[PDB]
């Protein structure tokens, strides 16, 4: 560790790889998101991890598409990235206001609409293909 | 004595049924009263959008 810290070439190559910083957080958030998403699929995810999955999806659907295919963001991407966060937050806001909390109330199992998973992932893939 | 039998042998069965019902409910609720595993908020209720 000490011969790495005082190393000139290590720091110089560190600065060489300092050139590529915005794309590293954009990819590590994907790993953190898939980890939290597997945990939420298992079912022990706190609300922070769920909003983190939401944030990772919104970043790679409204911050990344013009960060890679243009190399730079100005104008629309920040506005629509926050607009998605703003638009996801009515089923969460209403269901904290007109409820005690977000705790799932016991209900009739045939009321919730369920669809085959291949159709769901087909819809998601089509939506991303349209946005990209 | 002048007194023949009174209210019934049927409403005694009714009050015995009530007694037995409440006794079984108390006995059941004294054993399986606490089984709590997890309470995760459904802050991603997917049926609303997805
Ligand atoms: C903060 C959120 C993360 C933004 C992620 C955006 C992103 O990954 O964009 C990469 C582009 C540059 O790539 P290249 O084609 O220049 O190699 O780089 C950018 O344009 C980054 C702009 C970062 C804005 C701050």
A33, A57 Cβ separation under 8 angstroms: yes
Cα–Cα separations (whole angstroms), residue B46 to A83, A106, B37: 19, 16, 23
Judging by beta carbons within 10 Å of its beta carbon (0-12, 13-18, 19+), is residue A40 exposed, middle or buried?
middle
DSSP-H helix ranges across chain A: 2-5, 8-17, 22-42, 47-62, 65-68, 76-88, 94-97, 117-131
CA distance A9 to A6: 9
A21, A40 Cβ separation under 8 angstroms: no
Phi-psi region of B18 (alpha: psi -120 to 50; beta: other; left: phi over 0): alpha
Closest-CA residue, ligand 1 atom 4, reads A22
Please state the φ and ψ torsions of residue A2, each to the nearest 5 degrees: -70, -40
Phi-psi region of A43 (alpha: psi -120 to 50; beta: other; left: phi over 0): left
Identify the closest residue of chain A to B44 by CA–CA distance.
A50
Which residues in chain B are closer than 8 Å to A61, comparing Cβ atoms? none
User: Tokens in use for A58?
Assistant: 């919104």
Closest-CA residue, ligand 1 atom 1, reads A22
Cα three-residue angle A63-A65-A70, rounded to 5 degrees: 105
DSSP B43: T
**For this experimental structure, what is the resolution in angstroms?**
3.3
Kind and range of the H or E run holding B18: helix B11-29
Q: What method did the depositors use to determine the structure?
A: cryo-EM
Which of A39, A86, A93, A104 to mutate: most B Cβ within 10 Å? Answer: A104
- In the block, residue with structure tokens 């104008």: A75
| Closest in A88, A103, A112 to B41, CB measured | A103
A63, A73 Cβ separation under 8 angstroms: yes
Phi-psi region of A75 (alpha: psi -120 to 50; beta: other; left: phi over 0): left
């Amino acid at each position: 560790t000490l011969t790495l810290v005082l190393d000139p070439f290590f720091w110089m190559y560190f600065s060489w790889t300092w050139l590529f910083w915005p794309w590293f957080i954009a990819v590590g958030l994907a790993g953190y998101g898939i980890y939290c998403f597997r945990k939420h699929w298992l079912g022990e995810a706190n609300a922070f991890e769920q909003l983190g999955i939401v944030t990772s999806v919104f970043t790679w659907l409204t911050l990344v598409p013009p960060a890679y295919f243009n190399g730079y963001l100005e104008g629309w991407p920040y506005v629509f990235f926050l607009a998605y966060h703003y638009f996801f937050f009515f089923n969460v806001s209403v269901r904290k206001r007109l409820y005690g909390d977000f705790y799932a109330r016991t209900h009739d199992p045939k009321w919730d609409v369920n669809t085959p998973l291949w159709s769901r992932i087909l819809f998601g893939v089509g939506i991303m293909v349209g946005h990209w | 004595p002048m007194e023949t039998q009174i209210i019934s042998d049927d409403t005694w069965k009714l009050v015995d049924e009530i007694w037995d019902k409440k006794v079984e409910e108390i006995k059941a609720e004294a054993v399986i009263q606490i089984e709590e595993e997890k309470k995760k908020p459904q802050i991603l209720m997917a049926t609303h959008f997805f």
